[PDB]
Amino acid sequence: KHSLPDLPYDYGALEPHINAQIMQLHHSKHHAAYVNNLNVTEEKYQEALAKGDVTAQIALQPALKFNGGGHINHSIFWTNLSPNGGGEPKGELLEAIKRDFGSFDKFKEKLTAASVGVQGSGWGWLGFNKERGHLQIAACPNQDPLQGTTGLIPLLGIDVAEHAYYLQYKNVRPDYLKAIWNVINWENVTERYMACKK
Amino acid sequence: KHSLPDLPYDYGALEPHINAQIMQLHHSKHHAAYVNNLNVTEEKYQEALAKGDVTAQIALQPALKFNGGGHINHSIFWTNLSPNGGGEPKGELLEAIKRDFGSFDKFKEKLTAASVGVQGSGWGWLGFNKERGHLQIAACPNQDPLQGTTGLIPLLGIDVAEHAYYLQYKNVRPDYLKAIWNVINWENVTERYMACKK
Amino acid sequence: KHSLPDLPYDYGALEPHINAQIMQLHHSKHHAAYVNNLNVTEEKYQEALAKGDVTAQIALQPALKFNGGGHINHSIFWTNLSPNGGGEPKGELLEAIKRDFGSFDKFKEKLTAASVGVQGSGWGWLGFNKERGHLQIAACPNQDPLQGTTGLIPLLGIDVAEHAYYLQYKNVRPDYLKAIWNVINWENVTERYMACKK
Amino acid sequence: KHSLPDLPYDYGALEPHINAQIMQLHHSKHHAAYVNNLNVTEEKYQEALAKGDVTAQIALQPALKFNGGGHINHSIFWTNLSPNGGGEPKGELLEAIKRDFGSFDKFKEKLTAASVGVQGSGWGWLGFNKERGHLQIAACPNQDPLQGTTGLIPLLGIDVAEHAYYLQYKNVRPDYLKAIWNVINWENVTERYMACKK
Ligand SMILES: [Mn+2]
Ligand SMILES: [Mn+2]
Ligand SMILES: [Mn+2]
Ligand SMILES: [Mn+2]
Structure with missing residues (x-):
């Protein structure tokens, strides 16, 4: 159960x-x-x-x-x-980011664009490609899960269903994505990264 | 344009x-x-x-x-x-309803169930089947339009994207469907019906 | 198993x-x-x-x-x-077919069109709508089953995946459809129809 | 036209x-x-x-x-x-293939798996990810084009629709894949690769 x-x-x-x-x-x-x-x-x-x-x-x-x-x-x-999140991650995860995406900011740009890009309900993810052994961004419609449908390992997810932000940000999904970076738990993302890099 | x-x-x-x-x-x-x-x-x-x-x-x-x-x-x-809507439709449209769906209430039930049934964003429609020459309910995901994707002629549509009700009804989509029947413009629906029954 | x-x-x-x-x-x-x-x-x-x-x-x-x-x-x-199929069905099934599609010939054409209409692999089906209580034609992609994905009760199916006709009729799928009507087992279709008669 | x-x-x-x-x-x-x-x-x-x-x-x-x-x-x-295809590509393309898939043989297997993996009609592709700057394998259903639906630049495609092999290899799609590697035009693939080198 x-x-x-x-x-x-x-x-x-x-x-x-x-x-x-x-x-x-x-x-x-x-x-x-x-x-x-x-x-x-x-x-x-x-x-x-x-x-x-x-x-x-x-x-x-x-x-x-x-x-x-x-x-x-x-x-x-x-x-x-x-509530203690925000800022940027450290060590390897970051290393992989500046590598797979150029710079942290280029990463934020790409994940945000992927999240705002979702038409209808969905999720923007930062995943890990085990076969290729590198990071990868993807978008899933509605509630389709990252791994179950892409094989990628979820590291950081950003819900763009309107119930995730509408009451506060209304139609302005961009303001929502902007604000969420302030509460990202990089400790947990780092954790998830190292977990599949074994 | x-x-x-x-x-x-x-x-x-x-x-x-x-x-x-x-x-x-x-x-x-x-x-x-x-x-x-x-x-x-x-x-x-x-x-x-x-x-x-x-x-x-x-x-x-x-x-x-x-x-x-x-x-x-x-x-x-x-x-x-x-703002002057509500109640039930009259004449032929109604006749087709009690026929294609049994009773008005059975119609409301079926359209509501189709609208609440939408997973994610979408629309619940009361359409007309020109080939079969009868009414038909259908659900479309996100913004996919009824006619463009089903060939059915739209008569009455009910938007279930959360932006259509969330600020007022929150997650309780059922309360929303319940309330909307009070403002249905049956004049316009009747109009659309007679338009494809030519 | x-x-x-x-x-x-x-x-x-x-x-x-x-x-x-x-x-x-x-x-x-x-x-x-x-x-x-x-x-x-x-x-x-x-x-x-x-x-x-x-x-x-x-x-x-x-x-x-x-x-x-x-x-x-x-x-x-x-x-x-x-091997003894072909011809036309009788009694109830034939009646429903006239009621819902105009005539048997029209039906053939409707089901043929849906089958030939499949882009890629798929199926053309004559099914029964339990809720509406009438016959209905539908096309399903690949091997998606009729009842499982539409709710319609399968009565007669025509496989249009290329392995079902390519060796004989090559790309000319219409030749395959014209031929298959000669072996349709209307006894079995009638049985399936009568079974979903409630 | x-x-x-x-x-x-x-x-x-x-x-x-x-x-x-x-x-x-x-x-x-x-x-x-x-x-x-x-x-x-x-x-x-x-x-x-x-x-x-x-x-x-x-x-x-x-x-x-x-x-x-x-x-x-x-x-x-x-x-x-x-007719003179087959063998392996050289220089840059071969290098990228080792870099991204381990080795040429591994690549063949990856692309083979994706092609054989297609349920229904479809395509297996070796494409180029312009954003990530690396090779990538992808499968597309029916005739959905690679670049139009994924953004990847097509380099090498393998058609797995049944009309591409059924008359000869029947249901044994793997026999078809094993064979096609003998006629791949790596000169053309290399050209396509070098073209999307920016
Ligand atoms: Mn959510
Ligand atoms: Mn809306
Ligand atoms: Mn088959
Ligand atoms: Mn082909």
Whole structure:
């Protein structure tokens, strides 16, 4: 049974970058809904599978991917943020950044452009290519998870669904991306990097 | 050159069902952005076409469909609403409804379920099937327009992108669908119906 | 464990409309592979599910829908054909076909158009809409199964993947469609229709 | 008006790796059709654009991408082959291939896997990422063109639609891939590579 993870900080810890109302809604409503729906879909899958009901299994895919994906991405998202975050990362991660993207700023530019570029709901990710052994930016529609659909390992994710910023920034998604860099938990990103560079 | 249509009523005319802030943002920001982007994309298309640049033409498709679609759907949406709306339609349209869907309420149920069912951004539509000569409900992702992608003729559209309701209803998309029935411009829907039943 | 069903007739039983070389490869090679691959994928899915590995479940969807759908479609396709097929159906099914498509000939043309209309590999289907209570035509890409992805109950399917006709009709898919109508097993289609009569 | 390019060699020039019957049908029938259909679609697009009919432009996208892409891919595919092809490339291209894929043999396997990996009709590509400045492998469905849909510059393409190998290799696509490496025109691939060297 999948469960809703506690936020690692206070709902208002990311102020003024991401206000409290959003965080609380995002976590207690949006993410909680993914987990509940995921658990429901997964149980139906267990049944379809045991029955060899291929039709049901296939019918269940949209919900499995959307909700499962939602749980995956949001669980990562919370740890990617921190009230003590901001600035730039250090050591290897940074080294890989200035390398795979030129400079930190060129990296921020590229991730932001990828996030603002998403038409409709989606996510902008900083991932790691294990086959190529290097960093790589990608965008996923709706809740499709990075690894499950691209094979890339998620390091830093930026949710651009409107529920992630609309109450505070309205239609101006750019102001949102601008502000979020102030709360990036580079410690966690660094951690995720070193984890797949083993 | 495509243009942004004036709203047929006051930004606060649909209160309390859809509040003023949303309407104003939806129209002056969201829709205005579709038209501007559409005009830009279309001009690049004229160039690619004149040059026989098939790659560019294909590269331009995502933007053409998203923005063009946005303009198409929102232009229809505004007329589908009215401060004097609500209730049920009459004559033939209604006749077709009780027929193609059983009862008005069964129709509302089906359109609502189709709208709430949209994962991510999208639209729930009441369309007309010219080939079959009957009504039909459908859901379109993001801004993909009904006719351009299904061949169905749009009659009544319900925007479920979060920017269409989030500021007022938050994550509770159901409350939004519930409230919108109070401002449906059945006169306009009736009009659109009779227009393709010629 | 899913198994490869035997054909209800010999391989050359449908000559000269669909030669024996195609029937044999289509059944013994393509279908066989779907089944074996389906069993392998499900096994990996039960494991991913057990560990609650959502990422793995999502990554397995393409293989599952493709092989699972392939198994579903071809299993139905084989019974939709008969050395003694051809002609027209009777009673209820024939009636519904006139009611929904004008006439039998018109229906053929509608289903033919949808089948020939498939860009890439795919299927043309005559299905039953349980909610609307009427017949409906639909085209599915690759091996995406009808019921699993549309909800429609499959009645008659026509495979337009190139392996279903290329050795005999080459690129001229229309010649393949014209021919297949000569072996359609309307007895089986009628049975499927009557089955979804509630 | 787009035109059907002549092959740079005879139809049986690639025997026995790809027989003459396939080369001929593939060129004279499939490619020919893409071109004629592309010209017809563009004509309808210029008209829709002129009238500012967005709905029509959107509805024409499938035909445009499919036929347009088909024309782009095959035009490149023909030059990617040569009766005197085979072996390995040299200098810069060979170097980049070692740098990005480990070795030439590893590359073959990577591109082979991507090509064989295509479920349904499609293409396996060796492309060039202009932004990252390195080689990259990618698979495109149906006739979706590489550059138009991914941004990568096509260097070498392998068509895995069944019409490209079914008459000769039947369902065993791997046999087709093993063979095609014998006629790859690395002179042309090298040229394409050097062209996108900025
Ligand atoms: Mn979110
Ligand atoms: Mn909207
Ligand atoms: Mn088949
Ligand atoms: Mn081809």
